Amino acid sequence: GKKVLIVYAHQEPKSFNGSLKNVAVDELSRQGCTVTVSDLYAMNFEPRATDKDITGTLSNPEVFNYGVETHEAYKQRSLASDITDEQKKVREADLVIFQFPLYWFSVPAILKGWMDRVLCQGFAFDIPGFYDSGLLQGKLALLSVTTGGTAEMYTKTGVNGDSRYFLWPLQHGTLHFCGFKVLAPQISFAPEIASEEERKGMVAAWSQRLQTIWKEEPIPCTAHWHFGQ
């Protein structure tokens, strides 16, 4: 049996991102996987890291330190319910798929907020430890991203540089840090420019890849993979 969490960040159900999320739900559901979707915009997910994330009284109510307060609230089971609901979905998942349009070579702020607030100290990592000692060890993560820019722009000699360059903070700094094994990203380049046929072909390539997702090996999530030859 396999459990999948899809963290989805798009405002429009009829969008290309919406179609990629729906095809993921359809394919994984067909296989018999347990599937859950966290539709961040539909949930009006709170992205700001604030004192509202801790219930009851604070460890130090005179000087607010977000990381210290959330770490202590995690251990004392005093985190806001919106955070703990996401943590329960992550804890149960074997695979976490992030479905999003690229915003400023990164995730939209609503999804950045999910990472900031859900992946807290004590839950996803400790100080120490992280990376191979990360608390989410054994889990798989996959970034499914759509861009405005073409594939040619996202090349070593392209104006945007190699697409692997923008993946570093997400794949290494976040996912690998928490102990996830990272599967090769799914990048759907410039669907807004692409024809109806090319767009259908991009969602079919995603559905086809999902058919054998459990047979995939993770990438070596290293500086060499992201920046070297």
Ligand X SMILES: COc1ccc(C2=Nc3ccc(OC)cc3C2=O)cc1
CB of 1 vs a second copy, minimal distance in Å: 30
41-45, long-range: CB within 8 Å, 24+ apart, which pairs?
41/9, 41/10, 41/11, 41/110, 43/82, 45/82, 45/110, 45/113, 45/114
Q: Lay out the site mask for ligand X across 67-86 (x = CB under 6 A, - = otherwise).
A: x-------------------
* SS3 at position 168: helix
Considering only the stretches 41-49, 57-65, 73-81, 145-153, report the one whose residues sit in contact with ligand X under the rule CB under 6 A: 145-153
For residue 81 the two structure tokens come to: 């319910």
Q: Is 192 in the site for ligand FAD (CB under 6 A)?
A: yes
Compute the distance between CA of residue 19 and CA of residue 150 in angstroms, rounded to an integer: 20
Backbone angles phi, psi at 114, to 5 degrees: -60, -50
Compute the distance between CA of residue 163 and CA of residue 226 in angstroms, rounded to an integer: 9
Compute the distance between CA of residue 142 and CA of residue 149 in angstroms, rounded to an integer: 21
Q: Lay out the site mask for Zn ion across 138-177 (x = CB under 5 A, - = otherwise).
A: ----------------------------------x---x-
Considering only the stretches 1-9, 88-96, 100-108, 131-139, report the one whose residues sit in contact with ligand FAD under the rule CB under 6 A: 100-108
Considering only the stretches 29-37, 39-47, 79-87, 193-201, report the one whose residues sit in contact with ligand FAD under the rule CB under 6 A: 193-201
Binding site for ligand FAD (CB under 6 A): 10, 14-17, 19, 49, 63, 65-67, 101-105, 116, 146-149, 173, 191-192, 196, 199-200, 203
